[PDB]
Design a protein around this nucleic acid. Structure first.
Ligand SMILES: Nc1ncnc2c1ncn2[C@@H]1O[C@H](COP(=O)(O)OP(=O)(O)OP(=O)(O)O)[C@@H](O)[C@H]1O
Ligand SMILES: Nc1ncnc2c1ncn2[C@@H]1O[C@H](COP(=O)(O)OP(=O)(O)OP(=O)(O)O)[C@@H](O)[C@H]1O
Ligand SMILES: [Mg+2]
Ligand SMILES: [Mg+2]
Lengths: 463, 463
DNA sequence: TTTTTT
């Protein structure tokens, strides 16, 4: 047969070009998988791999028309599709893949077996990926300044390290984290360090993903989150001001699912794979429209309690309760960070933290006791018990306290209930929470019959 | 005699390429029908079929331009169109078609007679399609944990295993299903299991198809469900909060018809075939704009009452009325599900359930008792009976009860209606319903004359 | 208004 078909067959035999389910062709060039929806990178591969072919086939690949013919043959012979990005414990670079389990770096065919379509965007360097380096001690000093290693801050520092370490994993995560602190506290420095550590796997979007409907019309903000591993949203408005849009809880529930529904402009694709940890940098406590048990299990908070002040205003910052330590700031730090001085030391520290927590299994846990707005419900869980058959026999005491056995179940009137809950809740500050909770569980037998099926745990105890 | 014309004729004589009603070209490659509007599948078929042609014809198909010429001839010889997807009880795979009546698996020409344009996307394997296997024993434990085999849960469990097995049929279903339950009850685990079981026949869309207008401009969220067999909408918000939009009562009526009007981007096709079971998983019960009899015959509800909790929060879970049992959570189940460990066992269980409920005939029925919003409309039909001619002779007794004859019809004026209706419904909870009802059925004989055409059943029985 | 469409 003709030599062009033989060249196409030999190229296909190396498995350097593949077709995905989304309809795009990926090519293995320069030790990386690359694709482009508007430029057919196939011809680049044809020109690049001309050296591996024998001598009599190299000369005919210098003409663009024969390259077009070979690309047409390859497109004809390529029929079926394959799946991509199935290994959550591999970190891809521009010249290889790093294994997070043991720490070796793989290049060439060894890295080809893990079909990763995303990368940091820069080459990995072994010389700078060391522990004993002049930059490392300085980075450790900076980090110990931001998060001191004290017995009081141990628990917060653990969440800090775990949340930062989770950015290397390519799996769905069921919790999003808030970075809370005052001004000049080090939150943006941490953001820029993470950006300079992970490169193109990092992205930041607007706040419209938390207050607006996601699936109405085109929405590039949701679409750009596909296959990313870290998403930052920062500088939320103060909700105390009038006209502020409160955070939608259903958006929070949707953002923790493995697939997110959204559509970019001029597109028909509506599914996006969610691999990104979500970090919200803020200065004020969040406010939600509706609070329920489903929302409280997807929220975590990390505190920042160190101030970096000019010498002129130091004496003022020492009189504030929002700070636990005041230190002079360095003016040249931001320029050093912008030049990627601490890229590989921070990456090495992130991998070292990855071994500590996520090797058995990757999991994030909520911290519902850090939000004041969640206080009302939490202690409600420790004060009331739903009515049951076991409470019927002891009615002798409950009728003494004012309970009524109505339809063979122990019951308490709303009017009888409200003062009883008023003795343990400050009616002035929790005025709205009490009327909120009473109305979603009222039970009315008749126009004049009112009752609620709950029993206090203190009354159930034997006196 | 043109050689390429002869090749085109021999290719066409094998019935390997067909033209559909929508203007698409379907090609039989690798024991499956495939079609795509952007890729040249005809050239792929021409290249693939060259081994069946005699040796003096095979060498001519190695040149792409000759393949384009044969493609042009084939396009010229296709003048008549055919119907597709007419067998509802056949499950298509990537390498064959499975019969749901007897259980046989067909491949090759035997499967070609069923013109199926969709597939699960993965190959069938009879080795793992067995009943005795460790994965089946594991899977039955999860299934029993989510839906216990107890007497109180029997009817709900049967409905649960009917709705899931309904997803293997390619017909139109006349009801919508709501998966209602509190958080951490396994609602999403069954969704993941069904996705892994059915592959490409599964689709998840947004909430706009229940709230917005489906026929204004392009709408991929409604046009991506053509010929699908399972559609999921997830996490609708709570409607108690201000600003939340309610569910269009007329939208769910269009989702039941065999044809749905919708348009993709850059497309003129406006007709979509309805073959999908529509499931919405929820944490709050839905609220509709308008309630009528046509609405109440299209809604079904399945309950989830088992809670999976960490050991820290077990004590609270036992004190919640929304749960019936609490079991320890498994942290490694999601990774196993994502790895398609329980794919073929769940497929076998779905087929076994399908043989139990749908072999005679396939139909779904509503459960209007579950929704509390309907409780008023359901009750009125049992308390009021429409006036009839046969009630005229009995009005001698009805005179003492306050009934008045108007236009030779038994009538009851508005003023005496309210205290009669107050003997069953409380004013506070049902005020908006009876106000709307009275305004929508009030009739006036004059400026000061009022009457209603209903009589109470309790009033035709002598007290 | 703007994606839509050209
Ligand atoms: N370890 C450190 N030693 C000295 N200066 C530091 C150190 N870490 C950060 N700084 C400096 O302190 C300042 C803190 O600014 P930064 O943007 O990080 O704070 P922030 O709390 O995130 O601010 P904002 O929320 O108002 O944007 C910067 O000038 C930064 O360069
Ligand atoms: N049979 C089981 N045994 C142990 N753990 C289980 C079992 N079934 C499910 N789980 C676990 O329960 C956890 C919570 O379940 P799941 O997320 O499906 O609940 P849900 O009610 O659908 O939640 P939501 O609607 O809030 O997303 C999961 O991590 C899952 O692994
Ligand atoms: Mg900052
Ligand atoms: Mg769920």
């Amino acid at each position: 047969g003709n030599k062009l078909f033989n060249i196409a067959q030999r190229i296909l035999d190396t498995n350097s070009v593949l077709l995905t389910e989304r309809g795009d062709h990926i090519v293995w060039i320069n030790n990386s998988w690359k694709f482009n929806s508007e430029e057919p990178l196939i011809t680049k591969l044809i020109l690049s791999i001309r050296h591996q072919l024998p001598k009599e086939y190299s000369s005919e690949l210098l003409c663009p028309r024969k390259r077009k013919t070979v690309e047409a043959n390859i497109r004809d012979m390529l029929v079926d599709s394959v799946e991509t990005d199935t290994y959550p414990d591999k970190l891809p670079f521009k010249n290889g893949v790093l294994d997070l389990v043991d720490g070796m770096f793989y290049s060439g065919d060894d890295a080809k077996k893990y079909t990763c379509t995303v990368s940091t965007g820069f080459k990995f360097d072994d010389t700078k990926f060391v522990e004993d380096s002049p930059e490392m001690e300085e980075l450790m000093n900076i980090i110990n300044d931001i998060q001191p290693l004290t017995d009081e801050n141990k628990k917060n520092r653990e969440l800090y390290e775990k949340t930062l370490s989770s950015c290397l994993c390519g799996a769905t995560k069921g919790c999003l984290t808030f970075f809370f602190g005052e001004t000049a506290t080090g939150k943006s420095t941490t953001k820029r360090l993470l950006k300079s550590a992970i490169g193109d796997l990092f992205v930041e979007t607007g706040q419209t993903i938390l207050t607006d409907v996601l699936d109405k019309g085109p929405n590039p903000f949701i679409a750009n989150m596909h296959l990313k591993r870290s998403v930052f949203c920062s500088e939320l408005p103060d909700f105390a001001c009038s006209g502020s849009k409160k955070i939608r809880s259903d958006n929070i529930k949707k953002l923790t699912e493995p697939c997110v529904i959204g559509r970019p402009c001029f597109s028909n694709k509506i599914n996006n794979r969610n691999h990104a940890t979500i970090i919200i940098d803020t200065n004020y406590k969040p406010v939600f429209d509706r609070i329920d048990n489903a929302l409280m299990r997807r929220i975590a908070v990390v505190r920042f309690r160190t101030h970096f002040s000019q010498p002129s205003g130091r004496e003022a910052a020492e009189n504030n309760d929002a700070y636990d330590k005041v230190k002079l700031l360095d003016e040249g730090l931001d320029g050093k960070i912008q030049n990627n001085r601490y890229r590989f030391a921070f990456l090495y520290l992130l991998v070292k933290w990855y071994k500590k927590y996520h090797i058995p299994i990757m999991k994030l846990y909520p911290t519902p006791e850090e939000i004041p707005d969640f206080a009302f419900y939490l202690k409600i869980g420790t004060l009331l018990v739903s009515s049951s058959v076991k409470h019927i026999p002891l009615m002798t005491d409950l009728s003494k306290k004012g309970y009524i056995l109505y339809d063979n179940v122990v019951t308490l009137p709303l009017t009888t209930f409200q003062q009883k809950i008023s003795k343990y809740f400050n009616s002035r500050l929790f005025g709205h929470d009490i009327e909120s909770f009473i109305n979603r569980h009222k039970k009315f037998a008749n126009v004049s019959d009112e009752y609620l099926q709950y029993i206090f745990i203190e009354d159930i105890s034997s006196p």
